[PDB]
Structure 1
Amino acid sequence: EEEEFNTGPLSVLTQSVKNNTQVLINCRNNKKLLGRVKAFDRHCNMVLENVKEMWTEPVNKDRYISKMFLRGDSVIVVLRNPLIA
């Protein structure tokens, strides 16, 4: 199982936790959560730090959330990048 977290597509999350790097999460709510992965699981539940939530309403909006838990079903996409840099 660890092997599948380590080398499979979830290695994106595994890599973000290890390097304390930022990732953008496109989300079902049409919102995007930008931050660092403290923890994750099979379902893509996550505990996130320094989250910048961004969305639109046209008007763009954002808000800072230091500490939060995301239920993984809401995940559409998870992006790793030269974002942290």
Structure 2
Amino acid sequence: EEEEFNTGPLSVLTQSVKNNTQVLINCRNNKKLLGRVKAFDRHCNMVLENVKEMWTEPVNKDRYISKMFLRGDSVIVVLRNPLIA
């Protein structure tokens, strides 16, 4: 199982936790959560730090959330990048 977290597509999350790097999460709510992965699981539940939530309403909006838990079903996409840099 660890092997599948380590080398499979979830290695994106595994890599973000290890390097304390930022990732953008496109989300079902049409919102995007930008931050660092403290923890994750099979379902893509996550505990996130320094989250910048961004969305639109046209008007763009954002808000800072230091500490939060995301239920993984809401995940559409998870992006790793030269974002942290």
Q: TM-score, normalised by structure 1?
A: 1.00
Q: Which runs of 5+ in 2 are unaligned?
A: none
Count of matched residue positions in the alignment of Structure 1 and Structure 2: 85
Identity %: 100
- Provide the rounded CA distance (Å) in 2 between the counterparts of 1:22 and 1:40: 14
In the TM superposition, what is the alpha-carbon distance from 1:58 to its structure 2 partner? Answer: 0.0
TM superposition outliers: structure 1 runs of 4+ over 4 Å: none
- Provide the rounded CA distance (Å) in 2 between the counterparts of 1:43 and 1:51: 20
Q: CA RMSD in A?
A: 0.0
- Provide the rounded CA distance (Å) in 1 between the counterparts of 2:58 and 2:14: 36
Q: Which runs of 5+ in 1 are unaligned?
A: none
Equivalent position of 1:5 in the other structure: 5
Which deviations, in whole Å up to 9, do the C-alpha atoms of 1:38-66 show, x marking residues without a partner? 00000000000000000000000000000
